[PDB]
């Protein structure tokens, strides 16, 4: 507890039931026990890419708030155009 609460890994916060729900929405009847760690890593990679692009946009704008338009532009850069948050 030095100056800012350095957050923990918080990738286990994507719990096993949440991954099961995401799979079930995808039409998955059975899930191997190793899927959870694999898709946790996949989600971490995807979030790292998108957040890196969004924070690049934010830092270029000389802002300190990752605005929803920044995330929309970051996703649009990667060919994952997101609707409903402006554009």
């Amino acid at each position: 507890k030095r100056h800012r609460k350095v957050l923990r890994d918080n990738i286990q916060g994507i719990t096993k039931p949440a991954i099961r729900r995401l799979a079930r929405r995808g039409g998955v009847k059975r899930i191997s026990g190793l899927i959870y760690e694999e898709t946790r890593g996949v989600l971490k990679v995807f979030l790292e890419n998108v957040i890196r692009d969004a924070v690049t946009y934010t830092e270029h704008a000389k802002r300190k708030t990752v605005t929803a338009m920044d995330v929309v532009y970051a996703l649009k850069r990667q060919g994952r155009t997101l609707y409903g948050f402006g554009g």
């Binding site: 929405r25 039409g27 155009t81 609707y83 409903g84």
Partner: protein, 107 residues
């Protein structure tokens, strides 16, 4: 003389004037033809009309009188051409269609 919107001249609901101003301010080209914004506004109105017609059909089939993101998702994905147009697009609060593979159904 009395003002008459170019959208009214073209029989379009969409804003021909705003489309022209966006084309000019968007640095798409040094010059922008007079008929270009009318054509683009008509195309945008058409695509909006198609998606809203399909979404309203979805809402009526779902016994709701108000279009929500789920109805837009159903309208977009249930149509082959619109889905292909919006293939790389994520619609917030859309979910996915009901699809269970025939292998997964019980024997």
């Amino acid at each position: 003389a009395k003002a008459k919107t170019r959208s009214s001249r073209a029989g379009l609901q969409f804003p021909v004037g705003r489309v022209h101003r966006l084309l000019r301010k968007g640095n798409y080209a040094e010059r922008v033809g007079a008929g270009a914004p009318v054509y683009l506004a008509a195309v945008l109105e058409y695509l909006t009309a198609e998606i809203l017609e399909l979404a309203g059909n979805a809402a009526r089939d779902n016994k709701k009188t108000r279009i929500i993101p789920r109805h837009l998702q159903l309208a977009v994905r249930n149509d082959e051409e619109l889905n292909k147009l919006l293939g790389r697009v994520t619609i917030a609060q859309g979910g996915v269609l009901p699809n269970i593979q025939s292998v997964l159904l019980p024997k």
